[PDB]
Amino acid sequence: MAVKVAINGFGRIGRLAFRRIQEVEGLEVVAVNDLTDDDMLAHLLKYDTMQGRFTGEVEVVDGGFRVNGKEVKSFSEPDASKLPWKDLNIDVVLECTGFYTDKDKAQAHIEAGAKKVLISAPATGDLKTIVFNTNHQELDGSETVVSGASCTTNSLAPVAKVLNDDFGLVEGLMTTIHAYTGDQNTQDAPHRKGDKRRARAAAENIIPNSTGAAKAIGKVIPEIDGKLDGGAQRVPVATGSLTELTVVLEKQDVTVEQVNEAMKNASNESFGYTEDEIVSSDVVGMTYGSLFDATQTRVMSVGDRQLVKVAAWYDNEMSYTAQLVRTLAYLAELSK
Amino acid sequence: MAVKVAINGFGRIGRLAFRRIQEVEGLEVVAVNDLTDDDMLAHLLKYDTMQGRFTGEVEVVDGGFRVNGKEVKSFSEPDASKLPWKDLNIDVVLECTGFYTDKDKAQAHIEAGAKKVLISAPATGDLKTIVFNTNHQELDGSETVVSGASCTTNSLAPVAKVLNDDFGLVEGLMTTIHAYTGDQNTQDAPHRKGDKRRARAAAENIIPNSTGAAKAIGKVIPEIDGKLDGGAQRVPVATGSLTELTVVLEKQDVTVEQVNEAMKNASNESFGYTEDEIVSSDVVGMTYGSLFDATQTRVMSVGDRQLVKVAAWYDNEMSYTAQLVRTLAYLAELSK
Amino acid sequence: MAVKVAINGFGRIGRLAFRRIQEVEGLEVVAVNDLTDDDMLAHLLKYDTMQGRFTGEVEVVDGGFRVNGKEVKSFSEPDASKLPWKDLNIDVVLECTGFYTDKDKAQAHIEAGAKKVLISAPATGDLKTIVFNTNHQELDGSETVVSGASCTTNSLAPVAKVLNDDFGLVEGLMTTIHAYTGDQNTQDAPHRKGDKRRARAAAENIIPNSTGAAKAIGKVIPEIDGKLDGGAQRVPVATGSLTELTVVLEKQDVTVEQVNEAMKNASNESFGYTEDEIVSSDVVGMTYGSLFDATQTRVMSVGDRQLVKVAAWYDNEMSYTAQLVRTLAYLAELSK
Amino acid sequence: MAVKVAINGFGRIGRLAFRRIQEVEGLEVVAVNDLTDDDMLAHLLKYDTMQGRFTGEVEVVDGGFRVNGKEVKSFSEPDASKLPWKDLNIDVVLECTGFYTDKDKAQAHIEAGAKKVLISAPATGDLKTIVFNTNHQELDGSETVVSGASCTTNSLAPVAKVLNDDFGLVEGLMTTIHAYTGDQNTQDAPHRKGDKRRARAAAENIIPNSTGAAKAIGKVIPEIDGKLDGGAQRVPVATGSLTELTVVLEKQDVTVEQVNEAMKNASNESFGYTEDEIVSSDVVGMTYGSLFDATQTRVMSVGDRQLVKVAAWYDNEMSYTAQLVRTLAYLAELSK
Ligand SMILES: NC(=O)c1ccc[n+]([C@@H]2O[C@H](COP(=O)([O-])OP(=O)(O)OC[C@H]3O[C@@H](n4cnc5c(N)ncnc54)[C@H](O)[C@@H]3O)[C@@H](O)[C@H]2O)c1
Ligand SMILES: NC(=O)c1ccc[n+]([C@@H]2O[C@H](COP(=O)([O-])OP(=O)(O)OC[C@H]3O[C@@H](n4cnc5c(N)ncnc54)[C@H](O)[C@@H]3O)[C@@H](O)[C@H]2O)c1
Ligand SMILES: NC(=O)c1ccc[n+]([C@@H]2O[C@H](COP(=O)([O-])OP(=O)(O)OC[C@H]3O[C@@H](n4cnc5c(N)ncnc54)[C@H](O)[C@@H]3O)[C@@H](O)[C@H]2O)c1
Ligand SMILES: NC(=O)c1ccc[n+]([C@@H]2O[C@H](COP(=O)([O-])OP(=O)(O)OC[C@H]3O[C@@H](n4cnc5c(N)ncnc54)[C@H](O)[C@@H]3O)[C@@H](O)[C@H]2O)c1
User: Fold this and answer.
1) Three-state DSSP state, D214
2) Following DSSP, what letter does each residue of A30-72 receive, concatenated?
3) Which residues bind D-glyceraldehyde 3-phosphate (chains A, B, C, D)?
């Protein structure tokens, strides 16, 4: 029998993690918690605007919903500490609500009976922040709370690591041209968090916004802590994003071909490499955490001084989710 | 000195009502209530994605904000019954939160000290529902709570009235191809009201939805109560909407020219008439409650049996708001 | 060996017909003609914004491109009469350029050597217009030029037939809320055809437009010729469309349940039936020609007089394409 | 009497240039040329998706259209060399077709009888490239063909000049997150220029693309020739754009406040300054060629090595047009 997973917050990441977990043996979602009725949950699992119809069968049943014959218990409890995790034998909670993004707060799940908690976002507190295939080996299995970092962090980390390992990273600035997300308002309206830019119509604007991804890349790659920073422009695509990274390197006389070859060599199931002139919708549903795009590599040289820019695609939904589920699996396998 | 208006809910309609009130003498907004800080409020008044920069000067001051030298007191009180309306001499509350859409609930403003309440939506309970220039003369000045109807009701009313007055309305069905609004989710997510369609990405879908507009047109035009019904398709424009009305008329041998001439004759500052082949973005900001579009008139005749279809544009924002503020002005003038 | 297909115009419908043909045994595309280089053709086959990555392998070769090991000859010839159809043994041309939508013009392919021509649109001239599973049996195999009708015609036909067969169709009007297409301008600009509405920014507007679908439904269902008419509102989704049909029926005391059951009974691989509260993106990629949506049925009754409204979803792209390919297959099978 | 202007290509820039010219005394548009009928031209002048209704009156007359009582002659001649510029006394052609972007080609207008040509784009050949208020004083009045550079170049120039003048520009890389434009396809289709990216659905994608803006900034600012490079991401807003510039400076220990103060001091009617948290739709219609946005300034410092990033907004339409008309006015004034 599988590792028993409970998803807290059946949102974009929660539901896609659910879908992704269907295709990973030894992981089962036995429970889902949100703030809504079961008809809504089943409906949002079946139908997904950007990610497509769920392929299996979804049925509403007493106390939850059944997916391909398998019963998922569901709950409507805003306070995680009151969830029946001890009774259900939860091995790991995928904390995907956006409201427990901190070690202390996530501990609610451990009190409620979960053995571990993996947060679908950056989190404050004394915990590890993990981008799979960049630093997942920093896990030893004894962690009770882990962060899977952010989508952007997952797109950035393998890129920054190659730049650092192969060229020496001096410093850099990043912009992610990022799809709009649920914390953005549909029409211009007050924003819960006081952000005057997330306050504006999501799908009608280029919207500058913050992110920690680059500032907190040091949590994932300690040897470059403090060397990156940058922000985001939220733009009107519902999913699919691009990280542009502009860097100063230690190596001199760096060429486009050298940067690209180095990226290619470091490719794996988390870090994709393409030379095709693709655009954002081509990466919707992709399971790479980061797709390095060699067509966008630039090297500006003035005398002995070089700036190097690179760009990596990610589906800020599915790319992140696939990374999150890998980390989940690995976290489980090490714990047993 | 002016009629003293308080806007409850500085939302899309609230803020646009504020802007529209700036250009109507004898009306002042002296107070605004919402659920946010003053920086947000001032910012959302200044900048508006679809409706353009606010032309005057907006400044944050102690206890509110100043618009062109005029002080607006602001509040952060989700329970209307606790607002200082008595102390401020509120003559009318523009109820624009979407949460007091019922005579009894809106009564909280009366208890708080407001003389009158006008609700920016259809509302249940023993009150009048008013589309300016279609039934505003049903007001006598003694009403304490009034509904300004919906945007769709305001687009539909003058059209249905002409159809009825001039041709006899037997029955009809309506569809409004309607811009998305703030009650719709940015990304597929749980919907507060359990509506599986309003739950979906607002700007990425054709989304079928309900409305009362047609079913409750009887509140505005009693002589055609129960003769209309229909729904909405929410589509990805951030504002600007079209109402398509398909009717069976008692008059025989009706022609396109007849329908069109009849609409033109009935035109005023609430009901515009056009023969130009416009599209939705051409009516953004317009102050007609309803723009009859003659180019879309159709008459299908099979023997003696005719179906007649017409279409009317409205800016679900500014068109409704202009109607609302006319009704507010009139309600005030009759009260004195 | 398969029926030998040439696709003229590797556009939206051309490429999707290509994809669809890959999964239908006894049909092969041996030739493609457009107005561009092979790199472009291959690229647009591989990547598709709304329809997803092509699953197989696509490679540019000398004189064309190779798909999963199979060679496709390609051409760049604007005058179809000059195509090497005789030399290539073309059994059927999928005419998908939008520029040969007439029997006489399409004859260019017969002169160039193709045995038959099937047009991806309504076409003038002495030829048959075919919606698969509604009137495809009107084909005997001796036709040299055939039209596959339009996307709208395919969504409307099975619906209209069931209304007529089961209830008696007196008359009706139709609106399709339709995704924007390639003959719509990106930004407001002159339009090649003089259409002041198709001239406007496709993805920023609700745009009223014509269609023949309903006026020429008589070509597909002769027994209701002249009884339907209507138009379109083009809206900003890149694909996925909805047909609303409002009708007068002969049968009295018709209920929603009756209309819905009658539609359900008529369902097949061309005509789907759903009771789920889906939205346009849920039909992207679907292969039904028409998805009847029971949640949108309405019956308006005033005394003895009834209006009945129904709505059917279609992917104006894939739904039409799947229909087109079925008709192509059938046309081939009857010819041999 | 005014400088007699003829607009070649009544497109986005052409029509907006027309509108802008209505509010600049001593400039008249007496003639317009495009590839379409007068009804379309007049319609597209009246109605504008992003830029709003034309305020004055537009009327179709014999041989052109009348704007506020003033006759504009119109033509339908793809070959500029055949235009009746001698007969009409054209002082300056605003070359806005996108098809004459080269000194030699634009010379067709001089042969046709125009005294001068100003091109609404970067242009090859022996001519000056002008960004108003950055290098317009490089004009002496004897030029017959001039380029007004690109929208991006206009947003970047005043920024780059300040960085250079005040800090010493070593090198930099730029990204413009740019609104989609008319040479982008509506749906994925072959692209006239073989660009596999401009080939994609303009409003559904983040689309990487080239620009010369930065590489040819050296035409406008010769003292920094060859020190900048960069590209674009076309995203789904219909207008309004942001230029991010990441730079290495000679001055050490630069702060955010220094960069911002430096930008503020250089502000004028071409180069605006804001500290407001605006978004793209807030700059639609603005007449600054560049709006420097202080909220986005970043300085990354690792020991003694700094990267400085800044961003300036521009309405790629109206910002560019306003700059183009300023350069037109000035070019005329010096010529007389
Ligand atoms: N959308 C993305 O690109 C993306 C990518 C990576 C990481 N993330 C992170 O994942 C988290 C969620 O993001 P999302 O886009 O899935 O958001 P979402 O809003 O789609 O989903 C959050 C869900 O949590 C539910 N919820 C809220 N409070 C709850 C409570 N206390 N108890 C139970 N359920 C509750 C909501 O009802 C909602 O369904 C955030 O921290 C976010 O930053 C998002
Ligand atoms: N938007 C339209 O096109 C449209 C048209 C006509 C009528 N309406 C109606 O107007 C009302 C508001 O619409 P909107 O589009 O402006 O929505 P919105 O979300 O912009 O406005 C809601 C505003 O009210 C505030 N609010 C919510 N609860 C509150 C509380 N109890 N106390 C104080 N403030 C509170 C919110 O913070 C927000 O500012 C709804 O009834 C809606 O149906 C909307
Ligand atoms: N939803 C839809 O877009 C859809 C659905 C049903 C039917 N149709 C019809 O099918 C046809 C094609 O539709 P589409 O959207 O795929 O077209 P499209 O705009 O994508 O382009 C069709 C292709 O024809 C090519 N072509 C090849 N030879 C040509 C020549 N001789 N002249 C002109 N073009 C040539 C063009 O380059 C283009 O790639 C049209 O008749 C259309 O109305 C489209
Ligand atoms: N943001 C912008 O759209 C923008 C900004 C700066 C510069 N520009 C540049 O200005 C130019 C115009 O751009 P646009 O956006 O207005 O393009 P557009 O397609 O909107 O307008 C081009 C117009 O020229 C017409 N035309 C008239 N005579 C022609 C002929 N002889 N041959 C070919 N076409 C003819 C076309 O019908 C069309 O209306 C291009 O160089 C473009 O790069 C565009």
Assistant:
1) coil
2) EEEE-SS-HHHHHHHHH--TTT---SS-EEEETTEEEETTEEE
3) 150-152, 181, 198, 211-212, 234
Q: Burial letters for B153-189: b for 16+ Cβ neighbours within 10 Å, e otherwise?
A: bbbbbbbbbbbbebbebbbbbbbbbbbbbbbbbbbbb
**D248, closest residue in chain A (CA to CA):** A307
| Nearest C-alpha neighbor of A314 from the set A71, A82, A110, A149 | A149
With b for 16 or more beta-carbon neighbours within 10 A and e for fewer, the B239-266 pattern comes to bbbbbbbbbbbeeeebeeebbbebbbeb
What tokens does A295 get?
């067509």
Residue contact D173–A230, C-beta within 8 A: no
Convert C86-111 to b/e letters by CB count within 10 Å (16 or more is b): eebebbbbbbbbbebbbbebbbbbbe
CA distance C31 to C67: 12
d(CA C244, CA C215): 15
Chain C contacts to A (CB-CB under 8 A):
43, 46-47, 49-50, 52-53, 276-279, 281-282, 284-285
Separation CA A302–CA D223 (nearest Å) = 13
Length of chain B: 336
Three-state DSSP state, B335: helix
- Closest-CA distance of chain C to residue A288, Å: 15
> Which 8-state DSSP code applies to residue B256?
H
| A96 classed as catalytic | no
From residue C41, how far is each of A294, C10, C76, D188 by CA, in Å?
22, 7, 11, 11
C238 touches D187 (CB < 8 A): yes
For CA atoms B321, B322, B327, B329, give the dihedral sign. positive
Token pair recorded at residue D58:
């537009």
The DSSP output letter for B295 is: G
Where helices occur in chain C by DSSP H, the ranges are: 12-21, 38-46, 85-88, 103-112, 151-167, 256-265, 318-335
Experimental approach taken: X-ray
Q: Over the range A116-130, which residues count as b (16 or more CB within 10 Å of their CB) and which as e?
A: bbbbbbbbeeebbbb
Residues B172/C303, Cβ–Cβ less than 8 Å: no
Strands D271-274 and D241-249 turn out to be unpaired
Query: What structural domains does chain B harbor?
Result: 1-149+317-336 (3.40.50.720), 150-316 (3.30.360.10)
β-strands D305-314, D241-249: how paired? antiparallel
Residues of D in contact with C181 (CB under 8 A): 186-187
- The SS3 of residue D124 is strand
Distance CA D326, CA D131 (A): 9
Ligand 2 mean position to B37 CA, how many Å?
16
Q: Which two tokens stand for residue C198?
A: 């198709």
